[PDB]
C-alpha cells in the first residue's frame, strides 16, 4: 500500500501574496495535500494546500514567500497529506518547528508515519483522570491540584516569570506517595534566551535523554507555528498510546500560535472573528488541546501544560477566553504579586483546576485536603475585600476580625504562595503549612470546614 505513481511538477504559479502561492492547471487537486517548491536559485521550501477549486489550488508556504516568482519557481505535488515520521529514538533529540534535526544528528529513521492531525478517540474509550501529580508547588498542589491526563494552561503576561514556573514543574513533577515523565516541548516564536534557558536546564538536571524538543524561535518563519504543536502532539501520542509512556507536553506560547493563524486568515481575506482572529479559532485550538488524557487498556497518558501571554494582561481577550472553554482550569500568573517580588506570582483567585475534586481526599492524598483548600480560598477572598475597604477608611475603622483576615492575607502570601525555584514541597507539607495559617482564626470563623475535620486537625 504505497504511492508508487510519479509526482507531477508544475511551473503554473499565478499569484504570490503574503504567505500564499496560488497555482492553476493542477490535475485533480487534493485538500490538505503537501507541496514542495523549488526557487530559481535551487532553494527548496514546503507547503500545504489550503483551498481547491477546479484546476486552482492555494498553498501556504511554511518557510515564507520571499524570492518566489511566477515563471521559474516550480511546485511538486506529493499525492498525500502531512504525515510525520515517528520513533522512540526521538527522545534525546532537538528539532526545529518543521521537525527537521538541529542537534547535528541524522533525520528520523521511521518506526511509523503518522498524520499530524491524529485520529479521533472514541469518548467510550477514554479513562477519567484521578492520579494526582505532585508538582512540588503549594499554590498548585494545595489549591489547584493536577490529575495525570488533565489539560491546564499557565495564563501569564509579558515580563512575568512563566518559564521558571514551567521549568520548575518539569524538574519537580511526579506522583503523590503515601514512574517518571517523558517530556515533549514545543516552542513557537520564543527568543534565543528562552530556548537556551529550557535546554540548559534539561542538560543541568541530567534528564535530557527523556525529552524531545521542537524549537521555532522569533527569527524562524511564522507559518511553521501552524504545524509545530501538531508535530509535538503526534510524537506524544506515539510515545503514550503505542510505547506506553507517561508524557508531559509543554506548548510555550499559544499566543504566538494564534497570531500565525491570524496572518494566514487575513491573507486569505476571510470573515474575521473577534480582534481579527479566525472565526474557526475555537475549533482549531480544540484540535490541539483535546489531544490529551488516558485510553482504555493502554498503560500510558498525555498531560498538557500550554502557556499563554495575555496581551494588555486581559483574560477576556479571544486567546485566553477560548482557551478557558476547552482546558480543565488555568494557573494565573500575576503582575501584582511579581511587582511585590513574590515567587511563584500565582494568583489563587482566578486560578482553577476542574479535575481536582476527584484526585484528592482519603487514600488519594489526605481527608482534610478539600476543606483546607476551600477555607484558604474563602479567607484570601475575604482578605482582599477587607484590604480594598481599608485602603479608603484607614486601619482605625477595622474590627479585630478584619485584622485577622489582613494578618492571614500577609502570612498566606509570605508562607504559602512564596516558595523559591528549587524548593519541592510535598502535598503533606503544603496542607500542614495550610493549617498553620488556618490557626490565625478561632474555630467559629472556619465555617467552610466540617466539625469532624476541625476536631481532628485544628488542635495539633
Amino acid at each position: 500500500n504505497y504511492l508508487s505513481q510519479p509526482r507531477l511538477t508544475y511551473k503554473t504559479v499565478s499569484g504570490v501574496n503574503g504567505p500564499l502561492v496560488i497555482l492553476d492547471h493542477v490535475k485533480f487537486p487534493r485538500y490538505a495535500e503537501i507541496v514542495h517548491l523549488t526557487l530559481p536559485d535551487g532553494t527548496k521550501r514546503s507547503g500545504q494546500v489550503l483551498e481547491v477549486s477546479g484546476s486552482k489550488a492555494v498553498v501556504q508556504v511554511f518557510e515564507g514567500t520571499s524570492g518566489i516568482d511566477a515563471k521559474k519557481t516550480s511546485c511538486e505535488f506529493t499525492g498525500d497529506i502531512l504525515r510525520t515520521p515517528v520513533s522512540e529514538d526521538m527522545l534525546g533529540r532537538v528539532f526545529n518547528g518543521s521537525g527537521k534535526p538541529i542537534d547535528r544528528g541524522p533525520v528520523v529513521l521511521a518506526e511509523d508515519f503518522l498524520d499530524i492531525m491524529g485520529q479521533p478517540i472514541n469518548p467510550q474509550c477514554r479513562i477519567y483522570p484521578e492520579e494526582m501529580i505532585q508538582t512540588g508547588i503549594s499554590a498548585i498542589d494545595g489549591m489547584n491540584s493536577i490529575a495525570r491526563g488533565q489539560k491546564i494552561p499557565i495564563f501569564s503576561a509579558a515580563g512575568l516569570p512563566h518559564n521558571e514556573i514551567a521549568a520548575q514543574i518539569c524538574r519537580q513533577a511526579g506522583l503523590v506517595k503515601k514512574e517518571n515523565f517523558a517530556i515533549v516541548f514545543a516552542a513557537m516564536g520564543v527568543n534565543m534566551e528562552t530556548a537556551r534557558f529550557f535546554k540548559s536546564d534539561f542538560e543541568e538536571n541530567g534528564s535530557m535523554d527523556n525529552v524531545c524538543l521542537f524549537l521555532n524561535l522569533a527569527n524562524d518563519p511564522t507559518i511553521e507555528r501552524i504545524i509545530t504543536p501538531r508535530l509535538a502532539l503526534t510524537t506524544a501520542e506515539f510515545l503514550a498510546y503505542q510505547c506506553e509512556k507517561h508524557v508531559l507536553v509543554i506548548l510555550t506560547d499559544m499566543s504566538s500560535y494564534a497570531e500565525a493563524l491570524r496572518e494566514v486568515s487575513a491573507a486569505r481575506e476571510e470573515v474575521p472573528g473577534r480582534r481579527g482572529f479566525p472565526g474557526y479559532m475555537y475549533t482549531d485550538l480544540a484540535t490541539i488541546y483535546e489531544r490529551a488524557g488516558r485510553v482504555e487498556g493502554r498503560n500510558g497518558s498525555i498531560t498538557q501544560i500550554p502557556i499563554l501571554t495575555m496581551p494588555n494582561d486581559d483574560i477576556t481577550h479571544p486567546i485566553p477566553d477560548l482557551t478557558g472553554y476547552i482546558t480543565e482550569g488555568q494557573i494565573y500568573v500575576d503582575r501584582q504579586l511579581h511587582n511585590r517580588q513574590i515567587y511563584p506570582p500565582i494568583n489563587v483567585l482566578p486560578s482553577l483546576s476542574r479535575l481536582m475534586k476527584s484526585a484528592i481526599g482519603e487514600g488519594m492524598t489526605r481527608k482534610d485536603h478539600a476543606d483546607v483548600s476551600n477555607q484558604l480560598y474563602a479567607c484570601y477572598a475575604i482578605g482582599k475585600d477587607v484590604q480594598a475597604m481599608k485602603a479608603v477608611v484607614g486601619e482605625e475603622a477595622l474590627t479585630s476580625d478584619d485584622l485577622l483576615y489582613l494578618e492571614f492575607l500577609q502570612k498566606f502570601e509570605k508562607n504559602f504562595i512564596t516558595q523559591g525555584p528549587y524548593e519541592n514541597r510535598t502535598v503533606y507539607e503544603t496542607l500542614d503549612i495550610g493549617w498553620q495559617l488556618l490557626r490565625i482564626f478561632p474555630k467559629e470563623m472556619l465555617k467552610r470546614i466540617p466539625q469532624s475535620t476541625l476536631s481532628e486537625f485544628y488542635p495539633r
Partner: protein, 132 residues
C-alpha cells in the same frame, strides 16, 4: 541547520579552523621545537602541511574523516591564538620551551579561556604595544 549555520557554512567554517590552526602552529614554532603541542594538534595538523585542496578537506569534513565539531575546533583554535599572542607580544625577548609548554598546559586546563586573567593581561600588553 548545523549549530546556527547552514550545513555548507558549517563545513566551510571547519575547513577554515583547520587552515587557521596550521597558520598559528607555523608562527608559534617555525622550527618543530614544540613537540608536545604538535602531538596534541596532530589530528588537524595531518590535513594541513600535506598537499591538499579546499574542496577535498570540505568533502572529508562532510564525510566525518577529519575533525568536524566546531565547538571542539573553536576551543582548540583559541588556545593556540592566546599562546601566539603571548609569543608575539613578547617580540625581541624569548621564553624557555619549558615555560611555553607550562603556559600551554595552564591555558588548556582553564574552564573558559576568554574570561581568564591571562586573556586580560594579554589585552593589557597589546594595549601598551599598539600605542608604542
Amino acid at each position: 541547520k548545523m549549530g546556527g549555520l547552514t550545513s555548507e557554512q558549517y563545513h566551510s567554517q571547519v575547513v577554515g579552523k583547520i587552515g587557521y590552526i596550521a597558520r598559528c602552529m607555523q608562527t608559534i614554532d617555525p622550527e618543530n621545537n614544540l613537540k608536545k603541542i604538535r602531538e596534541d594538534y596532530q589530528d588537524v595538523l595531518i590535513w594541513a602541511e600535506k598537499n591538499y585542496r579546499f574542496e577535498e578537506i570540505l568533502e572529508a569534513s562532510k564525510s566525518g574523516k577529519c575533525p568536524n565539531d566546531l565547538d571542539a575546533l573553536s576551543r582548540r583554535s583559541l588556545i593556540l591564538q592566546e599562546l601566539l599572542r603571548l609569543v608575539s607580544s613578547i617580540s625581541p625577548f624569548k621564553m624557555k620551551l619549558d615555560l611555553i609548554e607550562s603556559q600551554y598546559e595552564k591555558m588548556k586546563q582553564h574552564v573558559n579561556l576568554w574570561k581568564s586573567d591571562y586573556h586580560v593581561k594579554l589585552n593589557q600588553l597589546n594595549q601598551l604595544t599598539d600605542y608604542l
